[PDB]
Write an enzyme that holds these catalytic residues in place. Structure first.
Site, PDB file in Angstrom:
ATOM      1  N   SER A 184      -1.783  -6.993  -0.844  1.00 46.24           N
ATOM      2  CA  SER A 184      -0.601  -6.090  -0.902  1.00 46.24           C
ATOM      3  C   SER A 184       0.700  -6.898  -0.872  1.00 46.24           C
ATOM      4  O   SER A 184       1.760  -6.301  -1.143  1.00 46.24           O
ATOM      5  CB  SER A 184      -0.638  -5.093   0.225  1.00 46.24           C
ATOM      6  OG  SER A 184      -0.279  -5.707   1.452  1.00 46.24           O
ATOM      7  N   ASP A 212      10.176   4.021   6.264  1.00 46.54           N
ATOM      8  CA  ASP A 212       9.942   2.677   6.859  1.00 46.54           C
ATOM      9  C   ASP A 212      11.084   2.373   7.840  1.00 46.54           C
ATOM     10  O   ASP A 212      11.910   3.277   8.088  1.00 46.54           O
ATOM     11  CB  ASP A 212       9.789   1.612   5.768  1.00 46.54           C
ATOM     12  CG  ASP A 212       8.897   0.447   6.170  1.00 46.54           C
ATOM     13  OD1 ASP A 212       9.179  -0.170   7.213  1.00 46.54           O
ATOM     14  OD2 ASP A 212       7.923   0.174   5.445  1.00 46.54           O
ATOM     15  N   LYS A 254      -7.084   1.540  15.048  1.00 45.75           N
ATOM     16  CA  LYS A 254      -7.581   2.055  13.745  1.00 45.75           C
ATOM     17  C   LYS A 254      -8.813   2.936  13.978  1.00 45.75           C
ATOM     18  O   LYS A 254      -8.924   3.970  13.298  1.00 45.75           O
ATOM     19  CB  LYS A 254      -7.864   0.893  12.791  1.00 45.75           C
ATOM     20  CG  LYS A 254      -6.643   0.063  12.412  1.00 45.75           C
ATOM     21  CD  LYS A 254      -5.437   0.884  11.998  1.00 45.75           C
ATOM     22  CE  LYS A 254      -4.440   0.102  11.167  1.00 45.75           C
ATOM     23  NZ  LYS A 254      -3.493   0.998  10.462  1.00 45.75           N
ATOM     24  N   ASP A 293      11.976   4.442  12.752  1.00 44.09           N
ATOM     25  CA  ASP A 293      11.122   3.674  13.695  1.00 44.09           C
ATOM     26  C   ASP A 293      10.186   4.676  14.384  1.00 44.09           C
ATOM     27  O   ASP A 293      10.688   5.534  15.133  1.00 44.09           O
ATOM     28  CB  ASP A 293      11.980   2.871  14.676  1.00 44.09           C
ATOM     29  CG  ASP A 293      11.189   2.201  15.785  1.00 44.09           C
ATOM     30  OD1 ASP A 293      10.826   2.904  16.746  1.00 44.09           O
ATOM     31  OD2 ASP A 293      10.944   0.984  15.677  1.00 44.09           O
ATOM     32  N   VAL A 294       8.880   4.572  14.127  1.00 46.57           N
ATOM     33  CA  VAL A 294       7.852   5.580  14.533  1.00 46.57           C
ATOM     34  C   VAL A 294       7.562   5.460  16.036  1.00 46.57           C
ATOM     35  O   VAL A 294       6.934   6.390  16.577  1.00 46.57           O
ATOM     36  CB  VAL A 294       6.561   5.454  13.695  1.00 46.57           C
ATOM     37  CG1 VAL A 294       6.843   5.602  12.207  1.00 46.57           C
ATOM     38  CG2 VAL A 294       5.805   4.163  13.970  1.00 46.57           C
ATOM     39  N   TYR A 351      -5.799  -4.232  17.427  1.00 53.59           N
ATOM     40  CA  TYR A 351      -5.599  -3.703  16.052  1.00 53.59           C
ATOM     41  C   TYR A 351      -6.760  -2.778  15.680  1.00 53.59           C
ATOM     42  O   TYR A 351      -6.503  -1.627  15.291  1.00 53.59           O
ATOM     43  CB  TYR A 351      -5.486  -4.837  15.035  1.00 53.59           C
ATOM     44  CG  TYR A 351      -5.327  -4.359  13.614  1.00 53.59           C
ATOM     45  CD1 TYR A 351      -4.110  -3.875  13.160  1.00 53.59           C
ATOM     46  CD2 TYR A 351      -6.393  -4.376  12.729  1.00 53.59           C
ATOM     47  CE1 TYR A 351      -3.953  -3.425  11.859  1.00 53.59           C
ATOM     48  CE2 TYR A 351      -6.252  -3.932  11.424  1.00 53.59           C
ATOM     49  CZ  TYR A 351      -5.028  -3.456  10.989  1.00 53.59           C
ATOM     50  OH  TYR A 351      -4.885  -3.022   9.706  1.00 53.59           O
ATOM     51  N   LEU A 387       0.860  -1.217   0.000  1.00 56.57           N
ATOM     52  CA  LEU A 387       0.000   0.000   0.000  1.00 56.57           C
ATOM     53  C   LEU A 387       0.883   1.250   0.000  1.00 56.57           C
ATOM     54  O   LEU A 387       0.560   2.193  -0.739  1.00 56.57           O
ATOM     55  CB  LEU A 387      -0.913  -0.007   1.229  1.00 56.57           C
ATOM     56  CG  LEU A 387      -1.937  -1.139   1.296  1.00 56.57           C
ATOM     57  CD1 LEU A 387      -2.870  -0.949   2.482  1.00 56.57           C
ATOM     58  CD2 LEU A 387      -2.738  -1.230   0.010  1.00 56.57           C
TER      59      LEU A 387
HETATM   60  N1  LIG Z   1      -3.459  -4.970   3.057  1.00 54.10           N
HETATM   61  C1  LIG Z   1      -4.521  -5.173   3.981  1.00 54.10           C
HETATM   62  O1  LIG Z   1      -5.162  -6.206   3.929  1.00 54.10           O
HETATM   63  C2  LIG Z   1      -4.874  -4.104   5.042  1.00 54.10           C
HETATM   64  C3  LIG Z   1      -6.178  -4.002   5.490  1.00 54.10           C
HETATM   65  C4  LIG Z   1      -6.514  -3.053   6.442  1.00 54.10           C
HETATM   66  C5  LIG Z   1      -5.528  -2.194   6.945  1.00 54.10           C
HETATM   67  N2  LIG Z   1      -4.222  -2.294   6.514  1.00 54.10           N
HETATM   68  C6  LIG Z   1      -3.204  -1.386   7.055  1.00 54.10           C
HETATM   69  O2  LIG Z   1      -2.376  -0.743   5.819  1.00 54.10           O
HETATM   70  C7  LIG Z   1      -1.167  -0.482   6.236  1.00 54.10           C
HETATM   71  C8  LIG Z   1      -0.134  -1.175   5.309  1.00 54.10           C
HETATM   72  O3  LIG Z   1      -0.301  -2.583   5.389  1.00 54.10           O
HETATM   73  P1  LIG Z   1       0.176  -3.539   4.204  1.00 54.10           P
HETATM   74  O4  LIG Z   1      -1.019  -4.277   3.671  1.00 54.10           O
HETATM   75  O5  LIG Z   1       0.845  -2.746   3.080  1.00 54.10           O
HETATM   76  O6  LIG Z   1       1.221  -4.619   4.787  1.00 54.10           O
HETATM   77  P2  LIG Z   1       2.706  -4.228   5.379  1.00 54.10           P
HETATM   78  O7  LIG Z   1       2.935  -4.995   6.641  1.00 54.10           O
HETATM   79  O8  LIG Z   1       3.783  -4.593   4.346  1.00 54.10           O
HETATM   80  O9  LIG Z   1       2.758  -2.659   5.633  1.00 54.10           O
HETATM   81  C9  LIG Z   1       3.044  -2.138   6.931  1.00 54.10           C
HETATM   82  C10 LIG Z   1       4.372  -1.334   6.839  1.00 54.10           C
HETATM   83  O10 LIG Z   1       4.480  -0.469   8.139  1.00 54.10           O
HETATM   84  C11 LIG Z   1       5.919  -0.692   8.617  1.00 54.10           C
HETATM   85  N3  LIG Z   1       5.977  -0.648  10.114  1.00 54.10           N
HETATM   86  C12 LIG Z   1       5.445  -1.331  11.155  1.00 54.10           C
HETATM   87  N4  LIG Z   1       5.920  -0.786  12.303  1.00 54.10           N
HETATM   88  C13 LIG Z   1       6.744   0.229  11.970  1.00 54.10           C
HETATM   89  C14 LIG Z   1       7.488   1.113  12.764  1.00 54.10           C
HETATM   90  N5  LIG Z   1       7.687   1.311  14.163  1.00 54.10           N
HETATM   91  N6  LIG Z   1       8.251   2.066  12.179  1.00 54.10           N
HETATM   92  C15 LIG Z   1       8.301   2.169  10.809  1.00 54.10           C
HETATM   93  N7  LIG Z   1       7.564   1.294  10.020  1.00 54.10           N
HETATM   94  C16 LIG Z   1       6.788   0.326  10.613  1.00 54.10           C
HETATM   95  C17 LIG Z   1       6.217  -1.863   8.216  1.00 54.10           C
HETATM   96  O11 LIG Z   1       7.652  -1.992   7.992  1.00 54.10           O
HETATM   97  C18 LIG Z   1       5.393  -2.082   6.789  1.00 54.10           C
HETATM   98  O12 LIG Z   1       6.279  -1.732   5.666  1.00 54.10           O
HETATM   99  C19 LIG Z   1      -1.073  -1.018   7.652  1.00 54.10           C
HETATM  100  O13 LIG Z   1      -1.138   0.018   8.546  1.00 54.10           O
HETATM  101  C20 LIG Z   1      -2.313  -1.950   7.795  1.00 54.10           C
HETATM  102  O14 LIG Z   1      -2.687  -2.004   9.235  1.00 54.10           O
HETATM  103  C21 LIG Z   1      -3.891  -3.242   5.555  1.00 54.10           C
END
Ligand SMILES: NC(=O)c1ccc[n+]([C@@H]2O[C@H](COP(=O)([O-])OP(=O)(O)OC[C@H]3O[C@@H](n4cnc5c(N)ncnc54)[C@H](O)[C@@H]3O)[C@@H](O)[C@H]2O)c1
Ligand SMILES: NC(=O)c1ccc[n+]([C@@H]2O[C@H](COP(=O)([O-])OP(=O)(O)OC[C@H]3O[C@@H](n4cnc5c(N)ncnc54)[C@H](O)[C@@H]3O)[C@@H](O)[C@H]2O)c1
Ligand SMILES: NC(=O)c1ccc[n+]([C@@H]2O[C@H](COP(=O)([O-])OP(=O)(O)OC[C@H]3O[C@@H](n4cnc5c(N)ncnc54)[C@H](O)[C@@H]3O)[C@@H](O)[C@H]2O)c1
Ligand SMILES: NC(=O)c1ccc[n+]([C@@H]2O[C@H](COP(=O)([O-])OP(=O)(O)OC[C@H]3O[C@@H](n4cnc5c(N)ncnc54)[C@H](O)[C@@H]3O)[C@@H](O)[C@H]2O)c1
Lengths: 284, 278, 280, 274
Positions: free
Chosen positions: A225, A62, A194, A91-92, A190, A43
């Site tokens: 994703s 990231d 959100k 790191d957030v 979670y 995403l």
């Molecule tokens: N793809 C789905 O099905 C879906 C559905 C609902 C919500 N989301 C949300 O979308 C966002 C992206 O998810 P995704 O599907 O791309 O999978 P993803 O796990 O690859 O994306 C999450 C990214 O956030 C980074 N992350 C986590 N903790 C971190 C920290 N302290 N500091 C810096 N980076 C950190 C991770 O490295 C990762 O690249 C997420 O927040 C997820 O909760 C995804």
């Protein structure tokens, strides 16, 4: 009266009757700069890529561990769409890195017109018996992490004396306990974060309207994703899409177009609301 | 079918709809029980016939002990004072033990403890934000956790009531700008989606989870802080044009805790005098 | 005389410290008079039986065809709860019958302090290809009918110079399309009318607050009311955590809450009685 | 499920906002939101039918010709009262005959009837239901009838309102939107049902809920104090403009929103937060 002449000047009715005007120009991001968090994930990188093609400078943010994958993505997007797409690790959950990210965003990029605060995580064992570790780990990353990253974004904007667009990634877990054949998915903490992110975005929209800053959320449904590749058999796939009328996972591009809309002037009168991208999940 | 879904229970002369609001034979606790909502909810449940533990900060022990003694005498039930800082995981672990030891079990919990940290606006500092999350969100989670842990361990159902807020749905309007409820609003929204998950997850175990979202309630917390112009100005966006009272929250907690709400779970009851309409 | 002395008198903090006070008295409907539409159905008669048992006089309102049933139920509840429970037939689609209802409500009861606008229908073939006949019939009964019966209720209240409580039966269908094994159930027009009733109730709550009138909606999920008669039953309860239908008494207790002083600061909102459906 | 379409020389995210070869209609096309939506869809490269009351026929023709010249697409004018089932039946046949097919519908026609308060009469109530609810259902029904008969998907867009979610607030009182709010709420759950029912047909159904938009309907009807009194609860502290609705309509109509169905986009400049 002069009152009516003031309104007619403030609010033009038909811009389409100008040859130079185009409704497509609204979806442009030319001469704009911003950052995307979780920009190693599907995403994040696809959203950033869409913002770059619209013609925006994008800092790919990231974990320190993703530095190599970030810098090569930053390079690939730069040569493809001829834009200043840089890479910045942060790191957030670490305030020191967030404080230094703020510094580098201003210095390396120039300013922040938009921020896609997408960084998030789902921790295993996130059910009714979610432990203190499982709970606090999710709260610290999703809620506190986002807040911090969101704060430095609208801090830069006001400090630089201009408006902008905040896009926070929420989820349907923030609206509904995800349904799986009688029982819910492990999204206890979670979902809470959100839902918190949503009402946080709503507050900033109200508070920062005077500053020309819009704040909205995207609540994606089941999006493919790459998060769980080879971790779901087709039996699981077809079972999960029971309650999705469109009977297919979303793709990163279908979220990227929504981020573009919220980031761009196309949504110039949209603030403090949510856009669900779930293929009709929310209907059930 | 038919045999397990009675159409007209009122046709039984020994049945009464009012018996569903009874809490006799029930035991539970209330966090923030020193505050307006908490103590009035606790007194309502006790008057309905429940044994209640009054839970609040260690510094409220004397007040809690006074209240607990007063309610026991008035209603003739086991009302006790039990101190717990909900930010302290050690005290929460000890609270679980003392609840079981001094009450016997937990059939209901009113998880009502919460704060509004000053400077909770767009420029919320790390301290203001994390303090609000640690008390409202994390504090409510773990106090909620020990309640349904006790229920399942003792092999019976029960009712969780979480105090959310109108701030959780909407940013409180006052004269063009919102009130400082940045972090506050976020934690109350989280509690609402937290209670929803538990409602779905704990249905198996016969446990119901619901939220109350109070609007403006004259609980004691506003005393000497607002004048009449401020009072009227705050209630501009409240159709009833008055603060709610502690008894009006207390009646709602009795409904959700009692069998009157037997088919009500994973939902929210707004008690805001029609605020949310606007 | 002090600003704080006025607030102390307006807003008592601890009414339980009054030995004459009881929280359970807030659920009494003694000296209260009102009516229930669709009072021949499961939700209607049970709600009426509850309010009567709480001590209210109740007019049981349904179609002319149900007159005998209403009379029997009205005579039954009167003997049981020792209140004035009467029958008043009215087709909610007929403006003359609703004007006649408003007269007989004032003539036979005396006034109206509460109204349960519960009358409603689910029309066969109410899907994406809902015809003009199916659509308009649903709207005429569910939306326009409920509006009329609700209107005369708050007209009587304001004409008699006192407050009261309006309770409108919405549905789960007003929030979401009911789930059955991949597809929505036929509630196209039905869902629309129940969502319309909710925002209709919300407007009245804001408008009538100054007149001391409260307006709330109940959104039942799956209630075994008698409208129904292992398979199918379980398919529908697949998305209901509690894995059982509600009973009429579980809706009746929710009505009594909203009709009584128990809900005195509750207006312009909805109470979902769906056994946790909404969560999924 | 492709992961990275952006890694492709023959791909643009902006192309998802194109309407080249798309055919559809806009009800209420005389008003600000209707004609500006039509103009936006026309400029994206769609054939657009402007649909409004028979009394607007002359205005619709002048617009239809103006829009056809500027954007070089077949933009036509069709008269139809949505309260008249015969004219809606005639519209369906004329839509297919003059456009070829319907790939999208913006069901935007609506009225705010005066005296629509707690004492809204039978006449004020039923008029609002007839026009806003039953009329929107009709024009919606013929749209997804054509799509399915012609065996292809499409995008339905229904104009709801803020009034559908919340009773509009002005100096401590609700504005008269009793029946209005009810119809706009009904349209949102109607759209949600269609989204679930027609998903398999490749048809999407979404609503737009505008707050206060200076469309032309407010011209000469409010003064400055009244204007400011309404924007008390709008953080952006200004009315929206027709272009800001048009950009939202284009997003929901176009492939940009390919995974967006059975939901609502509020365009109220932050109203919903209060
Ligand atoms: N793809 C789905 O099905 C879906 C559905 C609902 C919500 N989301 C949300 O979308 C966002 C992206 O998810 P995704 O599907 O791309 O999978 P993803 O796990 O690859 O994306 C999450 C990214 O956030 C980074 N992350 C986590 N903790 C971190 C920290 N302290 N500091 C810096 N980076 C950190 C991770 O490295 C990762 O690249 C997420 O927040 C997820 O909760 C995804
Ligand atoms: N009164 C209102 O208008 C209103 C409106 C919306 C929400 N609420 C919420 O209702 C609940 C009760 O409100 P109230 O009016 O009675 O206010 P209150 O402050 O009097 O009651 C809250 C109680 O929680 C206790 N508390 C704070 N931090 C604690 C901690 N770490 N551990 C244990 N206890 C702690 C406090 O001692 C207090 O007794 C609160 O959660 C509040 O946020 C109140
Ligand atoms: N599963 C459920 O029970 C359920 C769920 C959600 C909503 N509801 C709604 O609850 C209400 C009562 O439902 P029920 O379970 O008792 O079913 P029901 O059909 O037995 O009760 C509805 C009653 O309304 C009456 N009615 C229909 N049109 C009328 C008209 N013009 N004038 C006067 N009366 C008329 C009917 O005669 C009927 O007695 C309805 O509005 C229904 O839509 C029911
Ligand atoms: N402008 C705003 O602030 C606002 C806010 C919320 C909702 N809306 C809604 O947006 C839509 C467009 O409104 P607008 O601002 O352009 O005002 P408008 O009145 O100028 O446009 C609505 C058009 O619908 C047409 N109409 C009325 N009855 C009709 C009927 N039976 N059949 C066919 N056409 C009919 C009208 O001719 C009109 O051109 C409406 O549905 C309105 O309710 C507008």
């Amino acid at each position: 009266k002069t009152v009516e002449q003031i309104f007619d000047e403030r609010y033009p009715l038909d811009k389409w009757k100008d040859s130079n005007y185009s409704i497509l120009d609204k979806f442009s991001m030319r001469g704009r700069k911003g950052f995307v968090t979780g920009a190693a994930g599907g995403l994040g990188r696809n959203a950033a890529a869409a913002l770059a093609q619209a013609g925006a400078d994008v800092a790919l943010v990231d974990l320190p561990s993703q530095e190599d994958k970030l810098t090569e993505l930053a390079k690939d997007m730069s040569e493809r769409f001829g834009t200043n797409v840089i890479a910045l690790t942060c790191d957030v959950t670490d305030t020191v890195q967030v404080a230094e990210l703020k510094t580098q965003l201003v210095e390396q990029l120039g300013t922040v017109d938009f921020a896609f605060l997408n960084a998030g995580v789902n921790v295993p064992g996130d059910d009714q018996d979610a432990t203190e570790e499982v709970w606090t780990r999710t709260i610290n990353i999703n809620l506190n992490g986002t807040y911090r990253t969101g704060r430095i974004a609208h801090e830069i904007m006001r400090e630089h004396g201009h408006g902008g667009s905040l896009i926070f990634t929420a989820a349907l877990s923030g609206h509904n306990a995800n349904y799986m054949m009688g029982s819910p998915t492990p999204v206890n903490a979670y979902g809470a974060t959100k839902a918190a992110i949503m009402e946080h975005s709503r507050y900033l929209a109200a508070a920062l309207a005077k500053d020309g800053i819009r704040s909205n959320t995207i609540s994606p449904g089941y999006v493919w994703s790459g998060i769980f590749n080879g971790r779901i058999d087709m039996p699981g796939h077809d079972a999960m899409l029971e309650v999705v009328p469109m009977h297919r996972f979303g793709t990163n591009d279908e979220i990227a177009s929504t981020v573009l809309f919220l980031a761009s002037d196309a949504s110039s009168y949209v603030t403090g609301t949510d856009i669900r991208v779930d293929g009709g999940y929310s209907v059930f």
